[PDB]
């Protein structure tokens, strides 16, 4: 097949109305461009991450994540002088930067 560019012309094709070579080329045209342009009627209809995203699950997760983070704010009756600060380094990041600074003189 792989019919033509002349078979795609408007003269050899039907229009809103109101030969043999044309009716032979339009067989191969409609037999080529209906196995090429047909959509996939099976799975892999996900196509990406941002099509199977769920508004209901994210809305439920945000309803939980706002409620518990607001219960963290108001109901935690620890005064501001008593809120102890967290460490800016870990127990492993403080070992690796003692190791690499020891090995930095090479």
């Amino acid at each position: 097949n792989i019919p033509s560019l002349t078979s795609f012309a408007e003269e050899n094709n039907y229009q809103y109305g109101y030969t043999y070579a044309q009716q032979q080329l339009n067989k191969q045209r409609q037999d080529f461009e209906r196995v090429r342009l047909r959509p996939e009627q099976l799975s892999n209809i996900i196509h990406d991450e941002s099509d199977t995203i769920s508004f209901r699950s994210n809305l439920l997760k945000n309803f939980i994540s706002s409620n518990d983070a607001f219960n963290m704010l108001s109901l935690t009756t620890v005064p501001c002088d008593r809120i102890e600060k967290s460490r800016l380094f870990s127990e492993k990041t403080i070992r690796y930067l003692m190791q690499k600074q020891h090995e930095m003189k090479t």
Binding site: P39, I45, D51, T52, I53, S54, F55
Partner: protein
């Protein structure tokens, strides 16, 4: 709201039922009674038009954001 509405209905009923009240405020209470008994019919027609107005703007990509096209 419902108790104040019932009290106003029973108050605009009494203003016309007696005969010592003047006719300038005897027929005005009558039409105020008419307008108060016509309230849930107004709610029905008002609800109907607004339900059709809401159905004007349902477009299947608001309610269905996970529509698979092709």
């Amino acid at each position: 709201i419902a108790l104040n509405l019932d009290t106003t209905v029973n108050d605009c009923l009494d203003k016309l039922l007696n005969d010592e009240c003047t006719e300038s405020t005897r027929e005005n209470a009558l039409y105020d009674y008419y307008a108060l008994q016509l309230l849930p019919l107004q709610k029905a027609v008002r609800g109907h038009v607004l339900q059709f107005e809401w159905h004007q703007n349902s477009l299947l990509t608001n309610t269905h954001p996970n529509f698979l096209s092709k």
